[PDB]
Design a protein around this ligand. Structure first.
Ligand SMILES: CC(=O)OCC1=C(C(=O)O)N2C(=O)[C@@H](N)[C@H]2SC1
Length: 159
C-alpha cells in the first residue's frame, strides 16, 4: 500500500460518487444525500465544504474525505469519508484521516478533530477508536425510513 494524497479534482467525481454501495453506506458518510448518489450531489458537497482530498494507490483513487465544519484555532469536523469497495480494510481511511488531521492543524490551527459516526457503522466506530478518538455524546437522528438512529459524536486532540 503506497498511498499518496491530493485535492479532489472534477475528474475524480464519478469514481468517488461510486464508492457508497447502498443507501445505508450513503447515509453513513453523507446523511443529507439522497440515494442514488451522483456526481452533482458530490460536487455540491465539495462546494459547500473545505479540504476535499483523495487518497491514491497504484494509480487509483481509493478514498475521499473533507471537512463539513472548520473553525480556525478551534476544531474541524471530518466528513464524507468514503473508500472504494475493493480497498476496504486496507488502511485507506486510516491514511486519509491522518492526512486530514495534518490539514486541520496546519490550515485551521485546529486543536481538536470532531468525527460523528452513525451507530450501525461498527467498522467506523472501531477505526476511529483505534485512531484515538473518544466518544463524547450521542444524538438522536433519523434514517431515510424515518427510523431512529444514534449518532455517536467523537473527538480527538490535535497538538
Ligand atoms: C466521517 C463521515 O463520513 O461522517 C459523515 C457525517 C457527516 C457528513 O455529511 O460528512 N455529517 C454531517 O454533515 C453531520 N450531520 C455529520 S453526521 C456524519
Amino acid at each position: 500500500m503506497q498511498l499518496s494524497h491530493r485535492p479532489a479534482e472534477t475528474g475524480d467525481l464519478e469514481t468517488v460518487a461510486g464508492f457508497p454501495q447502498d443507501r445505508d453506506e450513503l447515509f453513513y458518510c453523507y446523511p443529507k444525500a439522497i440515494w442514488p448518489f451522483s456526481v452533482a450531489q458530490l460536487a455540491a458537497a465539495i462546494a459547500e465544504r473545505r479540504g476535499s482530498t483523495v487518497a491514491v494507490h497504484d494509480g487509483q483513487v481509493l478514498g475521499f474525505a473533507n471537512f463539513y465544519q472548520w473553525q480556525h484555532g478551534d476544531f474541524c469536523a471530518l466528513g464524507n469519508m468514503m473508500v472504494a469497495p475493493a480497498a476496504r480494510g486496507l488502511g485507506v481511511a486510516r491514511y486519509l484521516i491522518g492526512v486530514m488531521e495534518n490539514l486541520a492543524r496546519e490550515q485551521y490551527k485546529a486543536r481538536l478533530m470532531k468525527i460523528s459516526c452513525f451507530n450501525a457503522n461498527a467498522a467506523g466506530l472501531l477505526l476511529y477508536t483505534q485512531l484515538g478518538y473518544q466518544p463524547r455524546a450521542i444524538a438522536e437522528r433519523h434514517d431515510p425510513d424515518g427510523r431512529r438512529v444514534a449518532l455517536i459524536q467523537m473527538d480527538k486532540p490535535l497538538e
